[PDB]
DNA sequence: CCGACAGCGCATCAGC
DNA sequence: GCTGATGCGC
DNA sequence: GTCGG
């Protein structure tokens, strides 16, 4: 776009730092970068130019300057045509597969989705669904088949028991035209703080043939596959079970957006409860710890 | 100069 | 067998 | 990598 050049190549450092070097704070340091330039409603003609926004310092406006005035960058080069770092980088798109075991299997020899395939012994349960799903994956949910989804997921919870409260939270919540998943919020009248009740939705949803894998089941979150009935792509979805007394307080974190839970955090509000600075509030719904704005809104 | 940068549920590893 | 650490995703 | 004590 205006920025598209400079905000890819900073997203691509992003992600080397992340993936390859294992540098999560320099990974975020490049997103925090890469967000803000693209906020900006400017052609950007010098590094000193972006260096006056914030996240964005010494070392990112030398690499701007060097990029305005070649059209590339050295570093990104030299990086893309490695084959160990391409790799590792690539092999992180598998669910399941991070920097460390990445960095394990190409060291081994094994670099690609084909040699994925053939060492499915040395691949955990997450990283085998994450490896059987790879394209589904990284696909974006249209918000008809989002609707759809939360058809059957608010049906077949209730028939489980009328008395569950489920929420569809996320950018859906906040009435986006695509989604990266499902994140459903649940909660029971019988579960307050510390006091099966997602075991029986699990159950009920794999007995429909709604929900087709398993990442990981406890008991007060589920992290699986779900797929509409027909063809359709598989899609990830997460189930939380939450208190009573907690469950409004983690809708509105849940719902988003990212830079809205940070904004309205700094203006303590956690994902679990609000305190005074202190004991936990009473909290019944969203309105509440607003009074201590419509999903369509919280962009920030 | 130098520490913070989100924190936690679950799976699986490291070690006793 | 167990506890705690680590990896991972979010 | 950037920010700020
Ligand atoms: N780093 C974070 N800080 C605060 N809240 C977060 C963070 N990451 C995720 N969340 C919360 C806000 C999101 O609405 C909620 C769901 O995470 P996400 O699923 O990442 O939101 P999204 O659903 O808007 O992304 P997408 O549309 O790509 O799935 O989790
Ligand atoms: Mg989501
Ligand atoms: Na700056
Ligand atoms: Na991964």
Redesign the pocket.
């Known amino acids: 776009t205006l920025n598209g050049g400079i905000t890819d190549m900073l997203t691509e450092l992003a992600n080397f730092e992340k993936n390859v070097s294992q540098a999560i704070?320099?990974y975020?340091?490049?997103r925090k970068?890469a967000s803000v330039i693209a906020k900006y409603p400017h052609k950007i003609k010098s590094g000193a130019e972006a260096k006056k926004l914030?996240?964005?310092?010494?070392?990112?406006?030398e690499k701007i300057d060097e990029f305005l005035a070649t059209g590339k960058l050295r570093k990104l080069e030299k990086i893309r045509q490695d084959d160990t770092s391409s790799s590792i980088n690539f092999l992180?798109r598998?669910?399941?597969?991070?920097?460390?075991?990445?960095r394990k299997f190409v060291d081994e020899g094994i670099k690609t989705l084909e040699d994925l395939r053939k060492n499915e012994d040395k691949l955990?349960?997450?990283q085998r669904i994450?490896l059987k799903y790879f394209g589904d994956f990284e696909k974006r949910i249209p918000r008809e088949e989002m609707l759809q989804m939360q058809d059957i997921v608010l049906n077949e919870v209730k028939k489980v028991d009328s008395e569950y409260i489920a929420t569809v939270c996320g950018s859906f919540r906040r009435g986006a035209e695509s989604s990266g998943?499902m994140d459903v919020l649940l909660t029971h009248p019988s579960f307050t703080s510390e006091s099966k009740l997602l075991h029986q939705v699990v159950e009920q949803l794999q007995k429909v043939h709604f929900i087709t894998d398993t990442l990981?089941?406890?008991?007060?979150?589920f992290m699986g596959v779900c797929q509409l009935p027909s063809e359709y792509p598989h899609r990830?979805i997460?189930i939380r079970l939450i208190p009573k007394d907690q469950y409004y307080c983690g809708v509105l974190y849940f719902t988003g957006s990212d830079i809205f839970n940070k904004n309205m955090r700094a203006h303590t509000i956690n994902k679990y409860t609000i305190r005074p600075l202190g004991e936990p509030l009473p909290v019944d719904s969203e309105k509440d710890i607003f009074d201590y704005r419509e999903p369509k809104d919280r962009s920030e």
């Open positions: 704070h320099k975020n340091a490049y970068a914030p996240g964005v310092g010494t070392k990112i406006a992180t598998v669910s399941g597969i991070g920097p460390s075991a990445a955990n349960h997450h994450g998943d990981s089941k406890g008991e007060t979150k990830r997460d």
